[PDB]
Design a protein around this ligand. Structure first.
Ligand SMILES: *[C@@H]1O[C@H](CO)[C@@H](O)[C@H](O)[C@H]1NC(C)=O
Ligand SMILES: [Cu+2]
Ligand SMILES: [Cu+2]
Ligand SMILES: [Cu+2]
Ligand SMILES: [O]
Length: 504
């Protein structure tokens, strides 16, 4: 089912069984993660009605529209503690924004705690009526979207120890090791046509190696940013990254396995495809309703992010020399006292959201809470951030709210590209020795989150806040009166309203 650009999103709890194990989950308009779609100039008005009442998972909510820059609408960006206070059970909040010409493949997810891990997440596609790559494919619709999701048999708040997915969900469906032969997702194609497949990771943690038996993947988009066409057999996708790839249905009519192998999971999930776990079906019209019997490519050409190149306005901003940006920041990641830190500080959410602190009179980073996690950025300048990998629990996929950035230096590469680098909004920091360097221009007044997108790391402190262009933040953003009321309502909630019932 589909949600339109002006619509209501009613959030409820119900039982779900995407892998044949039934447990309670979170539904949006009676559907597990429905598609949100519109056009690049639409004005979105999304009324989010929080009717959640199951105490085994988070009830208060906050929706993030991942990849949208939210210029002038920082109050609708959805990171609780930064842009808003949570929407409380029994209440509604109207988000109003526009893509402002930015087309691409995105996704929406709750930004509150680990609630998105329990299913409050889904694909969001913004179509371009002038798409630059329209000559490259014939079909692009609700049937060419492929979402990847990690799924747990117990509610996220009850996970004890290091999280390990029970299953990989492809378009909401999949199987777990030792589980029943639950229905697999089918992606239908016709021999001779070309399809713009939109691949989205909805993950709370695991990354996947994705490939389709017998077919190549011609990448033409990354994280809502178009690239020169670049063909590969297999790619590694991290939390919240998106790729559009042209699928050329040029093989014999047949059933082909679609494969998404996780880096971790219960009972051997990471190492097998046995019984159709970690799988979906690519079916050519005319093939029987049966399982594929194909096999993966033994020696795949692997996607390397430094091979991706931006199609439009390719050059990285600023002087084309490492360290020659207007503002040059280097962050030191750490893990101390059971908490991740950045430059010695572990992120903890303030009781007054940064945007509300700024609207209330804060004039500089020194006045903002929490102390040690907030970095001020000047207006209209070129920034270069460097975030060396090394810290445990990686690879850590960092994301920046409010901006897309050029990746002048990717993981696994020791070279810099200022002429043509891919532009994206979620980047892997790699492994020990890597020095991922990104660039962006500070053209979007407001407080924006910068943090690891593995939700278990975010909740243990791996986050910082950029207070960008503080002098123009009040003029640029003008939240509705309901926005400021969220905090009053939420601070007044009774203890039974936010209490988490654990399960074993
Ligand atoms: C943080 O710490 C590193 C290591 O001391 C230092 O080199 C870097 O300049 C610091 N970054 C910020 C933004 O303070
Ligand atoms: Cu996200
Ligand atoms: Cu991380
Ligand atoms: Cu975020
Ligand atoms: O996020």
């Amino acid at each position: 089912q589909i949600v339109n650009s002006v619509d209501t999103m009613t959030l409820t709890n119900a039982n779900v069984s995407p892998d044949g194990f039934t447990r309670a989950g979170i539904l949006v308009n009676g559907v597990h993660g429905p598609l949100i779609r519109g056009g690049k100039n639409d004005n979105f008005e999304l009324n989010v009605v929080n009717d959640l009442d199951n105490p085994t998972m988070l009830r208060p909510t906050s929706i993030h529209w991942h990849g949208l820059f939210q210029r002038g609408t920082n109050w609708a960006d959805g990171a609780d503690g930064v842009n808003q206070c949570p929407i409380s059970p029994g209440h509604a909040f109207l988000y109003k924004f526009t893509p402002a010409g930015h087309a691409g493949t995105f996704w929406y997810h709750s930004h509150f705690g680990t609630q998105y891990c329990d299913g409050l997440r889904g694909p969001m596609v913004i179509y371009d009526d002038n798409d630059p790559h329209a000559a490259l494919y014939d079909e692009d619709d609700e049937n060419t979207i492929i979402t990847l999701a990690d799924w747990y048999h117990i509610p996220a708040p009850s996970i004890q120890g290091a999280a390990q997915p029970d299953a990989t969900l492809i378009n909401g469906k999949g199987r777990y090791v030792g589980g029943p032969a639950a229905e697999l997702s089918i992606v239908n194609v016709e021999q001779g046509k070309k399809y713009r497949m939109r691949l989205i990771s909805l993950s709370c943690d695991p990354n996947w190696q994705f490939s389709i038996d017998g077919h190549e993947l011609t990448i033409i988009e990354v994280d809502g940013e178009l690239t020169e066409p670049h063909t590969v057999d297999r790619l590694q996708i991290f939390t919240g990254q998106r790729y559009s790839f042209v699928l050329d249905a040029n093989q014999p009519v047949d059933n082909y396995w679609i494969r998404a192998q996780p880096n971790k999971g219960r009972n051997g999930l990471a190492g097998t495809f046995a019984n159709g776990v970690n799988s979906a079906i690519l079916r050519y019209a005319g093939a029987a309703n049966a399982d594929p019997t194909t096999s993966a490519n033994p020696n795949p050409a692997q996607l390397n992010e430094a091979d991706l190149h931006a199609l439009i306005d390719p050059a990285a901003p600023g002087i084309p020399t490492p360290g020659a940006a207007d503002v040059n920041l280097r962050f030191q990641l750490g893990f101390s006292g059971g908490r991740f830190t950045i430059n010695g500080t572990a992120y903890e959410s303030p009781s007054v959201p940064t945007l509300l602190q700024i609207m209330s009179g804060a004039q500089s980073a020194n006045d903002l809470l929490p102390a040690g996690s907030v970095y001020e950025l000047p207006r209209n300048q070129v920034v270069e951030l460097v975030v060396p990998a090394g810290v445990l629990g990686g690879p850590h996929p960092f994301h920046l709210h409010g901006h897309a950035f050029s990746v002048v230096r990717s993981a696994g590469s020791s070279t810099y590209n200022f002429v043509n680098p891919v532009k994206r909004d979620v980047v892997s920091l790699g492994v020990t020795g890597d020095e991922v360097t990104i660039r962006f221009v500070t053209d979007n007044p407001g407080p924006w989150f910068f943090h690891c997108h593995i939700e278990f790391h975010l909740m243990n402190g791996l986050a910082i806040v950029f207070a960008e262009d503080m002098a123009n933040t009040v003029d640029a953003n003008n939240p509705p009166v309901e926005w400021a009321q969220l905090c009053e309502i939420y601070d007044d909630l009774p203890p039974e309203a936010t209490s988490i019932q654990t399960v074993v």
